[PDB]
């Protein structure tokens, strides 16, 4: 840590930058550093600007009249400024710096004393694990890695402690704001931080279903909610379990639905159901109206491709920072699933300029089958939700790679038996791409099943033999020992995949919540409703509907009173169970 | 059965009959010691049953609308043309694949025919294997007790 | 029933080392010890929200250990007054 502030005061150095002087190191220098190794939130713990830009004081800037890039509110420039009294986070001022130099027991001690206790703790979870992976090569990246799962342990237990006493209490202790952090609300905090363990705990699982099934209740079952769905009137019945039931709150039937078409689920539902038939719809304009017009049914396919990929246009203008336009998209460069969206798109853009071109509606018959399927790799990429689904489809992501694995074995290793087949009979059919048919195509046939034992069957021996050879060294080896390769490596990672897919979990529901209740045929409106905004608008200050609660004042200090109780709690019991441990007691 | 003008619908609503009672056939078999002890573990699977084949079923669907769209299938009647497009799909994975009618595109119908059950018989037939196996080894002494 | 009422009373107080003391000068051993097993996960559904919920919960099978142990020793010796002794009322 200490090298990054050897560089920062010389890439912001005396005369450039800093552009009176700066060998000085003072506070806006460390916190420029430390928002490096936090990430895109907002202005660091210290102040930067105007007021106490504290970069540029060892040349005469001047006073109180200046108030640009120099002293403003405080008293004296003595090559200082005063007292800039505690800003408000004087514990964690010390927990910051205790960390950075790798001193672990040197600051266990400090964190007892700590006011913001649960983002503290989590804070410093990631600033070890973003430095333990800049360097050292060793023996303290281990060390600081150590400390960080250290620190995440120490995290949960005092939120474990705070989530059994009064639970709804402990879910507002989660999603709030912390002045002393740079905003930066606990949940969000956590999961740059990557955070296996801290996010699979319980309640942090549970408060994501109380977001998700956002108004109704986590007890409705979920073959029961689909047909109160199509069914609109069924949904006014005594059938669904809502909340503003449970409170007789329905004075207007439509803010039933209003409360009920918002909730997480049937939007994700609306646009599955939307997604499961406009391939059905495509499923249409195959079979029958294979035609080289722009037909009456193909006319919204391209109103369709218009809809889709502008919620993407929403996902760009969605939350960036506010000068890089070109280095956010990396981040959707860095999802192959991305990459398996658009992927999709531009196999359109291969497929339609051969739809509209009236001579090639054979290879507009054979190139747009796959675009039918290429799609259901996206149909089952929004398909990891269910709880028997989810964290073991993680299973055939332990095995994408693995995919073009055993396929490039086995099929290979048909061929092994694809040219051993036609060789000693004298097989005579042949066409211009049918002699592939009865040389080529009729060897994977006989393997599920499709064997011309009349044809395949002098030569009748060693036909028994190969047969029997072949289909030793799949149908045992390639078979039921890749079984074995699976279910170990399903033994495996399994706990992982567990709290992977539990960590994976909050990542569709961000993408669900803020987003308003339209379908897929009526998102278009949306997508103009907020451009003739800015029509009237010139400023993106519409609205902040991300979890992000702030709380007031009087609250802040009921809930903080409360969990520094809860620390002092949890505190005493490791310092009990450490001196229950027997080899502590070998020791004593 | 009284209705006569139903014989039909009469024939064709009271064989699921045969096998509902069928379920409650084996209802009243839980009782042998090899039998009891681990048709508890399909107890651990009567919601799963409708996931794996909501699951397969649903993605036999994903070889089954692909299967008949490259070749010109021309078979088409009054409810068995979805015989000569849909129920033709499924006849095809426990063998029924009529070779001469399923066989220019040789290559390719050589291609997702490995392609997709490479998805099936590996992915949804051995590591659904693990699935069962470990949760037998789970709450087996549960399911004993 | 002289024992048995401190032992109701013992119980749904939660007095986990106070109610140990008094199944020992039990007279109807078995059920007394199997019947706070179901005192004990009645009302651990009940309500705490926690932290004694499950301390009920883990005293519930604490007796109930301590009621085959009981039975395992009387199983043993005898087995056919064992037996006579399950199903009395």
Redesign the interface.
Known sequence: FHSKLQKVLVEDPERPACAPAAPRLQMHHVAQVLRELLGDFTQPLYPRPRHNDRLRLLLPVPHVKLNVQGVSLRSLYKRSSGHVTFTMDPIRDLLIWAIVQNRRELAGIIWAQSQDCIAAALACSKILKELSKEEEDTDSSEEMLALAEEYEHRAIGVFTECY????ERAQKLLTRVSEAWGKTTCLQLALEAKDMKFVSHGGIQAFLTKVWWGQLSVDNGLWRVTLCMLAFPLLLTGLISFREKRLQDVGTPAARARAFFTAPVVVFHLNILSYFAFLCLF?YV?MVDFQPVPSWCECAIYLWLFSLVCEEMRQLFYDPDECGLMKKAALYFSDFWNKLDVGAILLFVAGLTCRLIPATLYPG??IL?LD??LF?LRLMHIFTI?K??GP?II??KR?MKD?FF??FLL?VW?VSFGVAKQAILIHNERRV??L??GA???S??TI???I?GYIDGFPEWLTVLLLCLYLLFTNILL?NL??AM??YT??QV?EHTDQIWKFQRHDLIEEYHGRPAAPPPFILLSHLQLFIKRVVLKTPAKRHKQLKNKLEKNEEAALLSWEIYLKENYLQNRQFQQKQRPEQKIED
């Not at 059994?164 to 639970?167: A, G, I, L, M, Y």
Request: hydrophobic share 55%; aromatic share 20%.
């Open positions: 059994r006493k009064d639970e499923a195959l018959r054979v089958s039918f399927i259901c269910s028997t689904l073991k299973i055939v095995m995919v055993f396929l099929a048909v791409d049918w592939f048919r080529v195509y009729h994977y046939l599920f099943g499709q011309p078979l890749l079984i699976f279910n399903f033994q399994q």
